[PDB]
Amino acid sequence: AASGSALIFDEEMSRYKLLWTDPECEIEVPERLTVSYEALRTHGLAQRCKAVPVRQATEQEILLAHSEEYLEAVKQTPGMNVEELMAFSKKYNAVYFHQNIYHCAKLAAGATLQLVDSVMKREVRNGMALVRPPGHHSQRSAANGFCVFNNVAFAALYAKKNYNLNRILIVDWDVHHGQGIQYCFEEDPSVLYFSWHRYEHQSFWPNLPESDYSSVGKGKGSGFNINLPWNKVGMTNSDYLAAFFHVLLPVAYEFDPELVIVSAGFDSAIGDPEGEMCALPEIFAHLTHLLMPLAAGKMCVVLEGGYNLTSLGQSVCQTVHSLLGDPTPRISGLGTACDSALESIQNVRNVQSSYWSSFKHLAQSETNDIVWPEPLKRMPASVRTVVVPPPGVELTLPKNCQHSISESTAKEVQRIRDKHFDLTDQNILRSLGNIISVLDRMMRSDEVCNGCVVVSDLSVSVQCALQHALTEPAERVLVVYVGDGELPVKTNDGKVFLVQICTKETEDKCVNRLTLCLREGESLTAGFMQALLGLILPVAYEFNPALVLGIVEETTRLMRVWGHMTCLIQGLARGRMLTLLQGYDKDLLELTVSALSGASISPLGPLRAPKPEDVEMMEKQRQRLQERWGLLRCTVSESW
């Protein structure tokens, strides 16, 4: 399977600029490209990507998305002087032309096609194109908002034609609406377009009625256009994550795309003068991370906007860091989305309830200057994953996993058995030595990121893992338990949150436990994913653990969702996760190690519908927990 990350960039795309006074376009400058590539170099990220050369898009490639009349017109701009270039530009809204912009527009588009080919040919796993001019405002016969040709639209149309793809997802996280992409695919159910964007009740450029949440697509495309308008500025990390957990991700995992393309404008970041939002550069590590289990990791990230040179470089690095599989930064201070964002989210979920199973329960009453801290260092672990199979069993491990007891650790095991345990089963005592050794190599280390240990006795293993973690000290521990019965886990001090997926319906009592009893049958997969995206991840992100403890008891239908969970759960605690598997199951063990190690997750297939019984259970959990954990909210709360 595919390995690295493509980086596509050429200096030539910085060789056009604005040649006259125009306050509407002053902000789009060649330095955006130079600063972003130079920040990737500074952080050692460009050196770790496969450089793929740019090329020109061909005439027939441009005609996939644009009219002969418009291409013929743009083709004449290289021969124009400044007066003619100014006259030509004024025919369009917020765009300038330059003798070299037609050349550069061909390169930005070809650069995007190069990335698609590298990913679809399995030459790389994923990649990013750093291009100018941007694309997503560009239309069939018009330049618009700095865009000449619609780079990302090309990518989807090209991938449809040349790879016979039937489902492509486009995520536009630029702060502006990509109306050029919306128009291109508005009737096409094979391309799912998602956009959030500063809107302010249509007072913000481009000032379009059809940028609102009620534009869902047309004809056979109904439901495959998703607009989330931001009606106030200052949106934060919590607003962006709420948008992902409660709108985009549920639909994207149900759609099950074969390719993901990101219209990656970083004018949605803190400090940007166009966006005026407040999200930290670190959030793009998580927006990237949360999408990577789709389409077997096949993701093409295409630069659009972003005008604060500092804000821009940091966000580009956080994105490539994530494409490279480096550990995600911890996001602190998360909570409820603001009221305007909850209104936008609840309105889009309601209008989309006719088209997506994650929202269908909503349709019937029966079912209800600017500064900020520099991002910290993200170093990939020497060995990413450590595994301790049962004694004897050697396994075929990925190149970045490794088998594991020191004299010091042996003394600690004896101390613990002497005070707290009596037990002499010499292998469930080797268990404890392995748990303590692997945890020490996770926390007080830097060399290892996560690990998986097979165990016999859950209660002493869990207790030893949990207690050793707490005194390390890891401030908070998220525990994810698949199984029944009660663990030696205390949730009465705030330092532990326990998620439990079980078979017997348990009444929860306090707001530090989430207990999900999902029914038996075919819909267990969709129900689990709905719970993961809409309940588990919101709470876990708000909790912000320093360690994730996963626990599976011996008794297998979740063996189809476990990979997605352990991939997504690595967005917490910088990927520091210890998974305890009770008993040897080679498939589950190999899958756990696969996902812990950063390998691609196999797709689920287009998702069925969850049972209404399960959706009712999940929304009762949300109602019970969302006052404590506001990131769970996907509606505006009632005022007194």
Ligand X SMILES: CN1CCN(Cc2ccc(C(=O)NO)cc2)CC1
- Tell me which residues are annotated as active site: 137
Q: Are 169 and 192 in contact (CB under 8 A)?
A: yes
Q: Measured at CB, which residue is nearest to Zn ion?
A: 305
With CB cut-offs between 5 and 8 Å by kind, which of K ion, ligand X, Zn ion, none does residue 221 bind? K ion
Task: For residue 467, list its beta bridge partners.
Answer: none
With CB cut-offs between 5 and 8 Å by kind, which of Zn ion, K ion, ligand X, none does residue 172 bind? K ion
CB of 630 to ligand X, least distance (A): 30
Decide whether 19 or 517 has the Cβ nearer to ligand X.
Answer: 19
Report d(CA 440, CA 469) in Å as an integer. Answer: 9
Of the candidate residues 267, 276, 282, 326, the single one contacting Zn ion (CB under 5 A): 267
Both structure tokens of 82: 């400044």
CB of 225 to K ion, least distance (A): 5
> Any idea which residue has 């590298």 for tokens?
118
CB of 152 to ligand X, least distance (A): 13
Q: How many positions of this chain bind Zn ion (CB under 5 A)?
A: 5
Decide whether 217 or 598 has the Cβ nearer to K ion.
Answer: 217
| Cα 67 off chain centre by | 34
Q: Are 78 and 16 in contact (CB under 8 A)?
A: no
Is there binding between residue 205 and ligand X (CB under 6 A)? yes
Is there binding between residue 304 and ligand X (CB under 6 A)? yes
Q: How many positions of this chain bind ligand X (CB under 6 A)?
A: 13
Is there binding between residue 137 and ligand X (CB under 6 A)? yes
DSSP 333-397: S--PPPHHHHHHHHHHHHHGGGT-TTTGGGGSGGG-----PPPPP-PPPSEEEEEEPSTT-----
Q: Give the range of 260-268, 284-292, 488-496, 499-507 binding Zn ion by CB under 5 A.
A: 260-268
With CB cut-offs between 5 and 8 Å by kind, which of K ion, ligand X, Zn ion, none does residue 224 bind? K ion
Decide whether 180 or 329 has the Cβ nearer to ligand X.
Answer: 180
Decide whether 265 or 598 has the Cβ nearer to ligand X.
Answer: 265
Q: Are 582 and 610 in contact (CB under 8 A)?
A: no
Question: For residue 559, which of 534, 594, 530 has the smallest C-alpha distance?
Answer: 594
Indicate the burial class of 410 (C-beta count within 10 angstroms; 0-12, 13-18, 19 or more).
Answer: middle
Residue 459's contacts (CB-CB under 8 Å, 6 or more residues apart) are 487, 488
Decide whether 30 or 603 has the Cβ nearer to ligand X.
Answer: 30
Of the candidate residues 305, 325, 575, 598, the single one contacting ligand X (CB under 6 A): 305
Decide whether 250 or 265 has the Cβ nearer to Zn ion.
Answer: 265
Q: Are 241 and 196 in contact (CB under 8 A)?
A: no
Report d(CA 516, CA 558) in Å as an integer. Answer: 13
Of the candidate residues 110, 145, 217, 550, the single one contacting ligand X (CB under 6 A): 145
Is there binding between residue 180 and Zn ion (CB under 5 A)? no
With CB cut-offs between 5 and 8 Å by kind, which of K ion, Zn ion, ligand X, none does residue 188 bind? K ion
Report d(CA 305, CA 263) in Å as an integer. Answer: 9
Report d(CA 480, CA 462) in Å as an integer. Answer: 11
Decide whether 275 or 293 has the Cβ nearer to K ion.
Answer: 275
> What strands lie across the sheet with 513-517, from one edge to the other?
401-403, 383-388, 448-455, 577-582, 547-552, 477-482, 496-502, 513-517
Is there binding between residue 534 and ligand X (CB under 6 A)? no
Both structure tokens of 156: 């989807």
Of the candidate residues 274, 276, 542, 614, the single one contacting ligand X (CB under 6 A): 274
Q: Kindly identify the residues of this chain, within the stretch 289-328, that bind Zn ion according to CB under 5 A.
A: 305
End-to-end, the C-alpha distance of the chain in Å comes to 56
Give exposure, 202-214, as e/b (b: 16+ Cβ within 10 Å). eebbbebeebbbe
Is there binding between residue 146 and ligand X (CB under 6 A)? yes
Decide whether 189 or 483 has the Cβ nearer to K ion.
Answer: 189
Q: Which residues of this protein are in contact with K ion, per CB under 5 A?
A: 172, 174, 185, 188, 191, 195, 197, 221, 224
CB of 306 to ligand X, least distance (A): 7
Q: Kindly identify the residues of this chain, within the stretch 70-129, that bind ligand X according to CB under 6 A.
A: 94
Both structure tokens of 145: 């908002």
Report d(CA 20, CA 26) in Å as an integer. Answer: 9
Report d(CA 33, CA 130) in Å as an integer. Answer: 7
Q: Give the range of 101-109, 169-177, 307-315, 568-576 binding Zn ion by CB under 5 A.
A: 169-177
With CB cut-offs between 5 and 8 Å by kind, which of Zn ion, K ion, ligand X, none does residue 146 bind? ligand X
Report d(CA 362, CA 353) in Å as an integer. Answer: 6
Give exposure, 395-409, as e/b (b: 16+ Cβ within 10 Å). eebbebbbeeeeeeb
Is there binding between residue 176 and ligand X (CB under 6 A)? yes
Query: For residue 111, how many other CB atoms are within 10 A of its CB?
Result: 26
Decide whether 196 or 543 has the Cβ nearer to ligand X.
Answer: 196
CB of 5 to ligand X, least distance (A): 24
CB of 337 to ligand X, least distance (A): 23
Q: Are 452 and 576 in contact (CB under 8 A)?
A: no
Of the candidate residues 24, 38, 587, 613, the single one contacting ligand X (CB under 6 A): 24
Decide whether 160 or 495 has the Cβ nearer to K ion.
Answer: 160
With CB cut-offs between 5 and 8 Å by kind, which of Zn ion, K ion, ligand X, none does residue 94 bind? ligand X
Is there binding between residue 132 and ligand X (CB under 6 A)? no
Residue 337's contacts (CB-CB under 8 Å, 6 or more residues apart) are 238, 239, 242, 243, 345, 630, 631, 633
Is there binding between residue 571 and ligand X (CB under 6 A)? no
Is there binding between residue 575 and Zn ion (CB under 5 A)? no
Is there binding between residue 178 and Zn ion (CB under 5 A)? no
Is there binding between residue 137 and Zn ion (CB under 5 A)? no
Is there binding between residue 267 and ligand X (CB under 6 A)? yes
DSSP 411-460: HHHHHHHHHH-----TTHHHHHHHHHHHHHHHSS-SSEEEEEEEES-HHH
With CB cut-offs between 5 and 8 Å by kind, which of ligand X, K ion, Zn ion, none does residue 135 bind? none
Residues that bind ligand X (CB under 6 A): 24, 94, 137, 145-146, 174, 176, 205, 265, 267, 274, 304-305
Residues that bind Zn ion (CB under 5 A): 174, 176, 265, 267, 305
